Design a protein around this nucleic acid. Structure first.
Length: 52
RNA sequence: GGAGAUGGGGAGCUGUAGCGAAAGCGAGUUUUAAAAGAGCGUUUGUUUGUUAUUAUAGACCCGAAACGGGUUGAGCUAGUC
Protein backbone atom coordinates (compact mmCIF):
# COMPACT_ATOMS: atom_id res chain seq x y z
CA UNK A 1 0.00 0.00 0.00
CA UNK A 2 1.17 3.52 -0.87
CA UNK A 3 1.82 5.57 2.27
CA UNK A 4 3.44 8.84 3.36
CA UNK A 5 5.61 9.84 6.31
CA UNK A 6 5.00 12.96 8.39
CA UNK A 7 7.43 14.89 10.60
CA UNK A 8 7.14 16.70 13.93
CA UNK A 9 6.25 20.00 12.23
CA UNK A 10 3.24 18.44 10.50
CA UNK A 11 4.45 18.11 6.91
CA UNK A 12 4.74 15.03 4.72
CA UNK A 13 8.07 13.60 3.56
CA UNK A 14 9.42 13.53 -0.01
CA UNK A 15 9.36 9.76 -0.54
CA UNK A 16 6.38 7.37 -0.42
CA UNK A 17 6.59 3.72 0.67
CA UNK A 18 4.87 0.46 -0.25
CA UNK A 19 3.77 -2.23 2.21
CA UNK A 20 4.33 -5.95 1.72
CA UNK A 21 1.54 -8.41 2.63
CA UNK A 22 1.18 -9.55 6.23
CA UNK A 23 -1.87 -7.58 7.34
CA UNK A 24 -4.02 -7.60 4.16
CA UNK A 25 -6.73 -10.24 3.67
CA UNK A 26 -8.94 -11.30 0.78
CA UNK A 27 -11.77 -12.85 2.83
CA UNK A 28 -14.72 -11.10 4.47
CA UNK A 29 -16.34 -11.75 7.85
CA UNK A 30 -18.18 -9.47 10.29
CA UNK A 31 -19.74 -11.92 12.76
CA UNK A 32 -16.22 -12.82 14.05
CA UNK A 33 -15.65 -9.08 14.46
CA UNK A 34 -19.11 -8.76 16.04
CA UNK A 35 -18.44 -11.29 18.79
CA UNK A 36 -14.93 -9.84 19.11
CA UNK A 37 -16.30 -6.42 20.01
CA UNK A 38 -18.95 -8.04 22.23
CA UNK A 39 -16.35 -9.93 24.28
CA UNK A 40 -14.34 -6.69 24.28
CA UNK A 41 -17.21 -5.08 26.17
CA UNK A 42 -17.13 -8.21 28.33
CA UNK A 43 -14.65 -8.71 31.19
CA UNK A 44 -15.73 -5.27 32.42
CA UNK A 45 -18.27 -6.20 35.11
CA UNK A 46 -17.10 -7.19 38.58
CA UNK A 47 -20.24 -8.70 40.11
CA UNK A 48 -21.04 -5.59 42.17
CA UNK A 49 -24.66 -5.85 41.00
CA UNK A 50 -26.21 -8.16 43.61
CA UNK A 51 -29.27 -8.21 45.90
CA UNK A 52 -30.76 -10.46 48.58
C1' G B 1 -1.08 -7.94 30.97
C1' G B 2 -5.55 -1.06 31.82
C1' A B 3 -7.95 -7.35 37.12
C1' G B 4 -8.87 -6.93 28.82
C1' A B 5 -8.67 -9.23 24.06
C1' U B 6 -4.39 -11.77 23.41
C1' G B 7 0.43 -14.52 23.66
C1' G B 8 2.37 -19.02 26.23
C1' G B 9 1.11 -23.32 28.45
C1' G B 10 -1.32 -29.75 24.08
C1' A B 11 -2.86 -31.94 30.55
C1' G B 12 -6.88 -34.05 28.69
C1' C B 13 -12.12 -34.62 24.57
C1' U B 14 -14.50 -35.59 20.45
C1' G B 15 -13.82 -38.58 15.21
C1' U B 16 -9.88 -41.05 13.19
C1' A B 17 -12.23 -49.53 13.18
C1' G B 18 -14.64 -51.93 15.41
C1' C B 19 -16.82 -57.06 18.14
C1' G B 20 -17.87 -58.60 22.92
C1' A B 21 -18.13 -59.93 29.54
C1' A B 22 -13.10 -61.65 28.03
C1' A B 23 -8.75 -64.08 27.29
C1' G B 24 -7.99 -61.62 22.14
C1' C B 25 -9.01 -60.95 17.14
C1' G B 26 -9.52 -57.49 13.40
C1' A B 27 -12.64 -54.98 7.56
C1' G B 28 -13.74 -58.60 10.75
C1' U B 29 -15.73 -59.83 15.61
C1' U B 30 -19.02 -62.87 18.74
C1' U B 31 -22.54 -66.53 19.10
C1' U B 32 -21.35 -71.92 16.26
C1' A B 33 -18.19 -77.82 14.19
C1' A B 34 -18.81 -74.36 10.60
C1' A B 35 -15.01 -70.77 6.32
C1' A B 36 -23.30 -72.43 7.96
C1' G B 37 -26.62 -68.56 9.14
C1' A B 38 -27.47 -64.20 12.15
C1' G B 39 -26.00 -59.69 14.90
C1' C B 40 -22.88 -55.47 15.06
C1' G B 41 -19.67 -53.40 11.55
C1' U B 42 -17.64 -51.80 6.70
C1' U B 43 -14.69 -43.32 8.78
C1' U B 44 -18.09 -39.49 7.33
C1' G B 45 -15.47 -33.98 11.47
C1' U B 46 -14.16 -30.39 15.78
C1' U B 47 -14.80 -25.56 18.97
C1' U B 48 -17.67 -21.76 20.23
C1' G B 49 -22.13 -17.83 20.02
C1' U B 50 -27.27 -18.41 20.11
C1' U B 51 -32.52 -20.40 20.88
C1' A B 52 -35.67 -24.11 23.10
C1' U B 53 -36.08 -28.41 26.07
C1' U B 54 -34.26 -31.44 29.84
C1' A B 55 -31.04 -32.68 34.95
C1' U B 56 -29.77 -31.01 39.96
C1' A B 57 -29.30 -26.74 42.92
C1' G B 58 -35.71 -23.33 46.76
C1' A B 59 -35.74 -23.58 39.97
C1' C B 60 -42.99 -19.86 37.64
C1' C B 61 -44.10 -18.36 42.11
C1' C B 62 -48.54 -18.14 47.19
C1' G B 63 -50.35 -21.28 50.58
C1' A B 64 -51.29 -25.44 55.63
C1' A B 65 -52.19 -28.35 59.93
C1' A B 66 -46.61 -30.55 59.78
C1' C B 67 -41.38 -32.72 62.21
C1' G B 68 -36.99 -32.00 65.00
C1' G B 69 -33.50 -28.90 68.42
C1' G B 70 -33.22 -24.71 71.64
C1' U B 71 -35.46 -21.00 74.73
C1' U B 72 -39.30 -17.84 78.40
C1' G B 73 -42.97 -19.50 81.40
C1' A B 74 -46.48 -20.94 88.53
C1' G B 75 -47.89 -13.37 89.38
C1' C B 76 -53.73 -16.36 85.16
C1' U B 77 -54.49 -21.07 86.72
C1' A B 78 -53.61 -26.68 89.28
C1' G B 79 -51.23 -28.60 93.52
C1' U B 80 -47.84 -27.95 97.51
C1' C B 81 -44.75 -25.22 101.19
Amino acid sequence: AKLKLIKIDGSFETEPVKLSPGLIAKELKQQPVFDAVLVEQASWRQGTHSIL
